[PDB]
């Protein structure tokens, strides 16, 4: 079957670009030189992060960036294409810092998508930046547009798509056409902002990269896995925000589509996308984290899972106290609540008191430090076996990860993902996916095929009766029904007619 | 202090109009002469019923009607205006028999409201019939337009209103304008057909007369009160069909407005109407029944209430077994499942074995026949004290009842309703409304008054936070909210400033 995408974000802060060096990890912890030809072949896309949208409403680099240094970092990434003729170096506009509701550039995203004129100017600028610096496509990473801004956002993506397609013909790039993707919400609260129009949002895209991580963190009162594949009934459950999206569905429809409370998992985000009509599985890309999130003040009994904790949830980390034992990266970056997999692996080999445990429902690992009362949720090569099998089974487009610079020095996590999809000597045919909780919502745009007698006008139906009419199977919600199916409150669409 | 409307239907079948007499109750049980001047003064409206919509898609009398006789009957009703200058003799078009989905004339209602041309033609015919026969207004009783037919129905009511207001000016009736009313569903199931557009339906009307009765009957498996004011937790509950109406509301909005299951009561229907914006309490009229519904084969334990039964639900009554002991009218009308208050009163005092009991949650009476296993749900002057106080407390337009011919010969039910609203020596200040279940849904039309600090752009809000914005009070459904009420679905409008 078609090769699965392996999309790795490459994030480098402005100060690191300005002082870019490949010989001092205290200045640039993960230079591009860490990506060898072998690693370049394991990737299909690298999303350079991040560019922004300025007050002139055009795509642009942070003005503090030294432009020559930026071109040089980008060149090192585009030079990797020499080793992999399928590789694309995309650039991502946005990210949380720039584009969140209270972000430094949020107004620019909202204003840029407002009118046909602003959208054209903004789209033209994305193509100009892509060609000027040598990128191969555009990833929009606005976190996140909401209700009133969605139509503009959709029109902007359509315009960018139109310009990129023309550029591909102009540049004779049919063999490796310019692409357009977005980073999408991987949890129902943020997803509810634009869920109703998902089909229109995904249509112009090669892929929608779901941010299926950060599903747990110090900002929540109960410790949990931040990227559980499936649910654990013993873990916390959440309000299903999609029930509040402007969908126009009935109470029964909303309830059947959006069980609540539910387990906030990777499988839930993926299935919520597939429930919508017009959202093809092949465009859905599952994101995975190359970092873990840590909590302190946890109780014993369940390895630190599902415990109250004493971890501040705000940003920036408000204290000078670095309590994640062995995490020297946390000290350098001034936050003991997050650590790259590279660092977590070193902690696990440093005999610091951590026990690596495994939850076989969620199919994810976690660290527990009994002596100090610490819990860390993270992902590794083992949880990726299950996530890679899920991507194959669900016919998803591939995997995305945040971020490359957090893999260990040998690039084991990236190598594992590539191995699970492509290695002749890896066989997951017997991998047991477990009995973790699956998301089982059904939407009016993903009904199962059902069979029932054609509706008969003039007939009075009892409660629970099933009939086929105008392409669907309908069920009555009460009795003495003398009206036909369709619009009328008494009938509920429950299946599709073959 | 606006006088409460007292709207009584006057129903007379075609065969009775054709053989009309005021001196032989075996032929016409309730002639117009039974409406004495004292009774005429106690009514504000009499809804003459029923006319229909014919194949020409125009308002018209049943074609079997002797017209000269019909005019004589109507003239007798309008002559009553000599005794009460506020009285209106309305005529009602429809009713269940003619207009239900499977009724003989249903297609005519559906077709009459379809186009601008058919609506204009139908509307003109209503005013023509009104003027020709001397009626004072039009009451539409289509039971009931379905979702797809509602926009047509609304347009038809608007056209009739336009023509009536024109006619009022042309006839110098500013002191007693021609009126337009409809008989509205009094239960959520039928109400769900047009509930989403209630404001538009009610705008052209003087009143929407809720048929808040027949909420129990032989078609239901469990015996129950047919017009409980409030709910009894021991009784049956029902699926709230309104949560499936095409409202476009969110899950939280639907759930808060439509608890399910719920108690199918008079209060439920009234509150359901008040939950919609644009439905003024003053236009809502509570219907009450002047008849009871009977069930056979009931068990003991709760006086016949909430029991299984063996009563056929089909129409016409599918048997010749008249089992309602003492009900002579039932034999005459060939159906032991329904009895006028007049007949029930006689049964109760005739030593036929009925015990009158009272449910103090529903505030309604019922009869139980222990020997034969019978249950009868009905209303009387006592249940009417609670319903009239409710009408006053809720600032409703008044009361409507089906039908005049079922009151006793002294007119006690009508006199009771009039007393409760207008007697200077009647005092219900101490009348306790009880602990029966109230319908507690909240919708756009009945948000509670609240106060909250003004929403502040830039501020992040936790779950449960309350703020004022755009004239309403809002509450967050989850945490870390960063945009504004009306622009972020995390906010639920819970109050009115």
From TrEMBL, chain A:
Keywords: Carbohydrate metabolism, Chitin degradation, Glycosidase, Hydrolase, Polysaccharide degradation
PROSITE patterns named in the record: GH18_1 (PS01095), GH18_2 (PS51910)
One GO BP: polysaccharide catabolic process
EC numbers for this chain: 3.2.1.14
Disulfide topology: 327-330
This protein's record includes keyword Hydrolase: yes
A Gene Ontology molecular function term of the record: endochitinase activity
Span of domain GH18: 5-424
Enzyme kind, highest EC tier: hydrolase
GO CC terms of this entry: extracellular region
Catalyzed chemical reaction(s): Random endo-hydrolysis of N-acetyl-beta-D-glucosaminide (1->4)-beta-linkages in chitin and chitodextrins
Alphabetical list of InterPro entries matching this protein: CBM5/12, CBM_sf_5/12, Chitinase_II/V-like_cat, Chitinase_insertion_sf, GH, Glyco_hydro18_cat, Glyco_hydro_18_chit_AS, Glycosyl_Hydrlase_18
Alphabetical list of PANTHER family matching this protein: CHITINASE, CHITINASE 12-RELATED
Family statement: Belongs to the glycosyl hydrolase 18 family.
Protein name: chitinase
């Amino acid at each position: 079957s078609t090769r699965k995408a392996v999309i790795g974000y490459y994030f480098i802060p402005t100060n690191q670009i300005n002082n870019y060096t490949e010989t001092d990890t205290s200045v640039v912890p993960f230079p591009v030189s860490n990506i060898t030809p072998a690693k370049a072949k394991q990737l299909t896309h690298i999303n350079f992060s991040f560019l922004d949208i300025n007050s002139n409403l055009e795509c642009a680099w942070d003005p503090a960036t030294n432009d020559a240094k930026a071109r040089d970092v980008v060149n090192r990434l585009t030079a990797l294409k020499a080793h992999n003729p399928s590789l694309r170096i995309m650039f991502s506009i946005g990210g949380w810092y720039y584009s969140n509701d209270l972000g430094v550039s949020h107004a620019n995203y909202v204003n840029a998508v407002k009118t046909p004129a602003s959208r054209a100017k903004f789209a033209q600028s994305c193509v100009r930046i892509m060609k000027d610096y040598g990128f191969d496509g555009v990833d929009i990473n606005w976190e996140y547009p909401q209700a009133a801004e969605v139509d503009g956002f959709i029109a902007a993506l359509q315009e960018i798509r139109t310009l990129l397609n023309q550029q591909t013909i102009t540049d004779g790039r049919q063999a490796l056409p310019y692409q357009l993707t977005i980073a999408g919400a991987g949890g129902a609260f943020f997803l509810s902002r634009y869920y109703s129009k998902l089909a229109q949002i995904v249509a112009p895209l090669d892929y929608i990269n779901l941010m299926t991580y950060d599903l747990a963190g110090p900002w929540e009162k109960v410790t949990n896995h931040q990227a559980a594949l499936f649910g654990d009934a013993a873990g916390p459950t959440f309000y299903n925000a999609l029930r509040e999206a402007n969908l126009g569905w009935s109470w029964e429809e909303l309830t059947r589509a959006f069980p609540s409370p539910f387990s906030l998992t990777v499988d839930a985000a993926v299935q919520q996308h597939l429930m919508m009509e017009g959202v093809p599985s092949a465009k859905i890309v599952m994101g995975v984290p190359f970092y873990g999130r840590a909590f302190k003040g946890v109780s014993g009994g369940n390895g630190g899972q599902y415990s109250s904790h004493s971890t501040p949830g705000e940003d920036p980390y408000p204290s000078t106290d670095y309590w994640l034992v062995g995490c020297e990266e946390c000290v350098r970056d001034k936050d003991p609540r997050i650590a790259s997999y590279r660092q977590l692996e070193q902690m696990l080999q440093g005999n610091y008191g951590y026990q690596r445990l495994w939850n076989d429902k969620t199919k994810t690992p976690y660290l527990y430090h009994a002596q100090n009362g610490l819990f860390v949720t993270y992902d590794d090569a083992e949880s990726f076996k299950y996530k890679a099998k899920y991507i194959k089974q669900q016919q998803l487009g591939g995997v995305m990860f945040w971020h490359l610079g957090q893999d260990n020095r040998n690039g084991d996590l990236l190598a594992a993902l590539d191995r699970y999809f492509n290695a002749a000597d890896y066989d997951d045919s017997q991998l047991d996916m477990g009995t973790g909780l699956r998301y089982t919502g059904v939407g009016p745009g993903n009904l199962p095929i059902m069979t029932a007698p054609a509706y008969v006008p003039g007939t009075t139906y009892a409660q629970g009766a099933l009939v086929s009419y105008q392409g669907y199977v309908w069920q009555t919600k009460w009795g003495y029904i003398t009206s036909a199916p369709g619009s009328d409150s008494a009938w509920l669409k429950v299946g599709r007619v073959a």
